[PDB]
């Protein structure tokens, strides 16, 4: 179904976001806001051809920036 295809993509996004968050040490509500921003990105005809780490890093950064915190893009790019 149309709603069935969304769930697998959202599950993959959640898995990758949690995998990065396990090394970023960010709280739960930041990850929740990042996942809702990822849902908004998919609703905006999500940018295809981009690397997966780029878009999840952008969503994680905008979620960590929407509340005043300390994380820097180098920490996102430290692998």
């Amino acid at each position: 179904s149309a709603l069935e295809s969304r769930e697998a993509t959202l599950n993959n996004a959640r898995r990758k976001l949690r995998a990065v968050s396990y090394a970023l040490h960010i709280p739960e509500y930041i990850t929740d806001a990042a996942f809702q921003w990822y849902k908004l990105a998919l609703a905006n005809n999500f940018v295809q051809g981009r690397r997966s780490q780029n878009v999840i890093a952008s969503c994680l950064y905008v979620a960590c920036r929407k509340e005043k915190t300390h994380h820097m893009l180098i920490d996102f790019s430290s692998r």
Binding site: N11, E28, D32, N44, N45
Partner: protein
């Protein structure tokens, strides 16, 4: 109670013989005692934490076989402060402190023996409330909703004030015969003795008489002219407005879905008039479980489930509706009711964003989305970013300002931004307000967003939707307006 020394010649110490094995002078002809002990002790129980010269084991005394008649006599004699009351209340108050193995048989045996001592002479052969007088009502206008379902039958209890929204198939096809089938489909609660639906004179209630003659119920569905003293017409009026508000929402996953939640929330709210909520005005239990866990989307095995659950938490909308319509304020205070607005909160502005024009029979009342305020000039001139600062497109008067754009919990969906967003989210709509008078632009209500926010549609993405019903309802709203 009667004594602190139990009589050992009974089943009590024989049950106490589970693991301590005191002594076995059970009784004369004790065939029942040992089989009862072995069966009801070796199989499941393993209870009765043993105590010396005590029968507390649970928190109830284990009354002996010899002592039961005396304690029941002292508990029942009205001269000895017993009351001689009914079986139910005596049975309830006799077992928080007494165990009485086979309590019910002993109680009913004592009652059927002592009835000759105190005979009761209530009349056997030959007065309102709790599904005795009932009334059901129809609705007038309602969308087809993807399965030609355009009907809602509210059934208002005359006493308990409990409603039931049913018969959501068709306006006329489920009105001759199937309305009897629908009254029968919620009549598993019970068969009312009188129905006073009060909608119109019908060929129905003749076939209803056929079913109640096929069964033995003496019901009647006369509904001669109307019951209308003071309040039932008011109840109908206030009921239909909420159902018309359901009419004014949810064009996909329609009101034929999640209507039970609407019924639960309606009968869960306290009436505030003459008593409490309908689920406790006749039933008396079942807290509503208000928490629906509208959080933790990152920990979710099914994200469609949490999306629809976040939709399920729209009960705040219904409660706000029935609280504000429970529906006025203080006159002439509204001019002073605008107050000091702090920098940072999102501000909603009226129609004159940069152009003020003749909006299409305007019922949107603020017409656009929120913006952020950064500076204020005076008490009647606030700066907030709408357009480029050419020709002063930045500041407007406070009469064109509002304050409140909050509660994302009650409104799950965000604000759509782009056309490519709008193409995909186009098939999630609530209402259509009016075409923008400039050239062609549509103004609409979307679903699961607050009605204050509005979303702009053009004809490019307007061809991929069920929009026939949208401009149909806009046309009949224009007919009502002019």
């Amino acid at each position: 109670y009667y004594k602190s020394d139990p009589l050992c010649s009974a089943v009590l110490i024989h049950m106490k013989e589970l693991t301590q094995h005191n002594v076995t002078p059970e009784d004369m002809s004790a065939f029942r005692s040992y089989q009862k002990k072995l069966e009801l002790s070796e199989t499941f129980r393993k209870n009765y934490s043993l105590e010396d010269e005590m029968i507390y084991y649970q928190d109830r005394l284990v009354v002996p076989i010899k002592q039961q008649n005396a304690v029941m006599r002292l508990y029942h004699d009205h001269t000895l402060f017993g009351g001689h009351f009914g079986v139910t209340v005596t049975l309830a108050k006799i077992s928080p402190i007494y165990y009485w193995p086979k309590l019910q048989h002993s109680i009913i045996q004592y009652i059927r023996t002592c009835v000759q001592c105190q005979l009761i002479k209530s009349h056997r052969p030959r007065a309102e409330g709790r599904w005795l007088d009932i009334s059901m009502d129809f609705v007038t206008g309602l969308p087809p909703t993807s399965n030609n379902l355009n009907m809602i039958l509210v059934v208002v209890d005359r006493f308990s004030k409990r409603a039931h929204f049913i018969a959501t198939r068709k306006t006329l096809d489920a009105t001759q015969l199937i309305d009897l089938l629908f009254r029968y489909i919620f009549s598993y609660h019970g068969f009312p003795r009188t129905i006073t639906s009060d909608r119109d004179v019908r060929m129905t209630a003749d076939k209803y008489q056929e079913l109640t003659k096929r069964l033995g119920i003496k019901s009647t569905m006369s509904s001669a002219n109307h019951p209308q003293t003071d309040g039932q017409s008011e109840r109908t009026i206030q009921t239909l407005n909420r159902l018309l508000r359901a009419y004014a929402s949810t064009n996909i996953q329609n009101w034929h879905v999640y209507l039970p939640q609407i019924e639960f929330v309606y009968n869960s709210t306290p009436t505030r008039t003459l008593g409490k909520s309908p689920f406790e005005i006749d039933l008396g239990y079942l807290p509503n479980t208000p928490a629906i866990k509208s959080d933790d989307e990152v920990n979710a095995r099914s994200f469609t489930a949490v999306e629809l659950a976040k939709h399920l938490k729209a009960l705040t909308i219904q409660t706000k509706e029935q609280l504000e319509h429970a529906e006025m304020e203080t006159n002439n205070n509204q001019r002073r009711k605008p107050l000091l607005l702090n920098i940072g909160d999102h501000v909603l502005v009226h129609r004159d964003a940069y152009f003020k024009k003749g909006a299409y029979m305007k019922v949107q009342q603020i017409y656009v989305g929120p913006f952020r305020v950064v500076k204020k000039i005076n008490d009647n001139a606030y700066e907030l970013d709408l357009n480029s600062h050419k020709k002063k497109h930045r500041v407007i008067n406070v009469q064109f300002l509002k304050k409140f754009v909050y509660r994302p919990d009650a409104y799950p969906k965000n604000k759509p931004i782009s056309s490519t967003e709008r193409i995909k989210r186009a098939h999630e709509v609530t209402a259509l307000i009016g075409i923008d008078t400039t050239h062609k632009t549509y103004l609409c209500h979307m679903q699961d967003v607050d009605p204050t926010l509005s979303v702009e549609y053009s004809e490019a993405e307007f061809c991929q939707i069920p929009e026939r019903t949208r401009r149909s309802i806009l046309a009949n709203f224009r007919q009502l307006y002019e």
